[PDB]
Symmetry: D2
Subunit: 159 residues, 4 copies
Amino acid sequence: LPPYHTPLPAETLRALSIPAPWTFGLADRVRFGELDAIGHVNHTAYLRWYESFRLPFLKARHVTDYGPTSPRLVLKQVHCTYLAEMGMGEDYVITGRVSNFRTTSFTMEFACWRLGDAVECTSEGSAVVVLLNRDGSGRYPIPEAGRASFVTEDGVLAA
Amino acid sequence: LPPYHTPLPAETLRALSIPAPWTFGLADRVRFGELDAIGHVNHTAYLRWYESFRLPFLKARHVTDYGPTSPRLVLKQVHCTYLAEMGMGEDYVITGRVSNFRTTSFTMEFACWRLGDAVECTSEGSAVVVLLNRDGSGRYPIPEAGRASFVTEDGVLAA
Amino acid sequence: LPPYHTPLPAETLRALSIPAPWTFGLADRVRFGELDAIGHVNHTAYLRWYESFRLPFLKARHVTDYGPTSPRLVLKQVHCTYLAEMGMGEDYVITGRVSNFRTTSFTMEFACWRLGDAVECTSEGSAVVVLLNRDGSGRYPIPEAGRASFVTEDGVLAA
Amino acid sequence: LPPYHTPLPAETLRALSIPAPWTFGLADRVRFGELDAIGHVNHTAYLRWYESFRLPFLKARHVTDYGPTSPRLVLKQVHCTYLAEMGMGEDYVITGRVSNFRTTSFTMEFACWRLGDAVECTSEGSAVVVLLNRDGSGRYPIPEAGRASFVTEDGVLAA
């Protein structure tokens, strides 16, 4: 088992049988409160896990520092698929990347890997995020160091 | 069935077989997302219902209008009891009242009444709330109209 | 304002300026607990609203009675778009339909209509749902009365 | 920082400056989804943390192994106090102990310790739990090993 709440690099992921293109994971465990009326992880927990991943990822990628001159990040769309049902206390790793970016918005892809006796993808997801100016003047361009990290870490070509 | 999300006065409560001392009720219905892994409303949903109740109630009692000037409401303590399990789709009424008050703080009591062939109290609870000046500078006295409404409407004797 | 938690037919929807193809709505109000750290309805609340809609809709459409010989309904995928941000206490109507069906699965589309000074669509959504046999023997065909309701109420051609 | 989601014994607690009487801790980190509309951990998240804690704790104390045979755990009451606000990403340790017990029921006490430059108790709480036979037929006596563990590990004098 890896440490929880700790960025996992590609090396650690491969050791856990989590394949490319994933380079950044975070591990957590299922909580009782995420279980629905028949004892499965509810469909929105997965989306919450992906949203939790985004916060530190987007700081590590130099998109935002969440401070006063940072862009406000706004979700435009999400999608989530449910490949295998999960239950109480299961350990998992969330992987997320940037798959595509534009001037003032970008797309991420996500997966949830259960660490059982087998490593198994239980869910995939995506999100489209827009950057807005906190002063209401409109869209805010992704910082240049963010564009650079997306290229050098996520391997997204700028073209 | 009374209307939902609408203050229900004492006479409406008595018609629903909800007794004294309750004079202010709000009706809603159990959601699927509130159910725990065995099909019962989870223990925190009750406390959320009591919280929801407090917002319109404290405006009705003249404590706050929730404007930019108004006091900050700070929760210091809650208790909740679980008298009967509730499942999917049950209608209920939340009742609440102020039971004590001093200068800048007060205690409320709550109950949950399941509507149905017979009306049944499924839970009781309490909260202690304090009032602070929004600008950080001190404690905020319960408005005079609040103190009076607590005495006349909630039947509290004095402080 | 319409009544809450009460199926709204096409007539009522049109009166609220909610256009075709919508024929079935349910009204509710935003709760404090659905608000995220900056005071907007969080992205998963919308998905919970759509899931809440499904439960009674699928019974009204004769897909399931949620009993022992009913299919188990399993979500395969969802998508949600966020068109306008929402805040505390806003009244809304959720509309949902079946847009397409197959033998053992179907697709629904959803929208959230805010009832403010203007009626405004704040979000759209979709879901793909599969029917499984509660005894584990695999997929379960959508009942014939369900197929019929989809055609006659949602206006989905079986072709 | 200790490991997360792992029972932390008394010696680990003292090294984190968490005092007697606590001997059993579990660490986690605040999530974005736990934050209320002003950026603070919402009052119910604490109670959820205490609940999460109880599950491994009651297995460690020999009350239940959560098998098909094991007792049903029923919550009758909780209290929670709010001593200091918590924001995004704070690490914490939950401590819990049994404080009293009788024949088929017991009372637990809990605290939340924010980890940081200095360790600070942000909340205290309590729960009353009863044990029922899973087959519906009666009340379930606290196993003898449970009673003994409560006396020796949690320092309870008798019943």
